[PDB]
């Protein structure tokens, strides 16, 4: 539901686990920012 907020990108690590990266703050996190 809804686009990611600007700056954010969804990726998958080398084991297949989905995470989210915020290119403004250079933080990566497991949690979908749209859930927050």
């Amino acid at each position: 539901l809804g686009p990611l907020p600007p700056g954010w990108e969804k990726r998958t690590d080398s084991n297949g686990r989905v995470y989210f990266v915020n290119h403004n703050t250079r933080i990566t996190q497991w949690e979908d920012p749209r859930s927050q």
Binding site: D13, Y19, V21, R26, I27, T28, W30
Partner: peptide
């Protein structure tokens, strides 16, 4: 665990 460091990501 935590996700990769950004500087590993990019």
């Amino acid at each position: 665990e935590a996700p990769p460091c950004y500087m590993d990501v990019i």
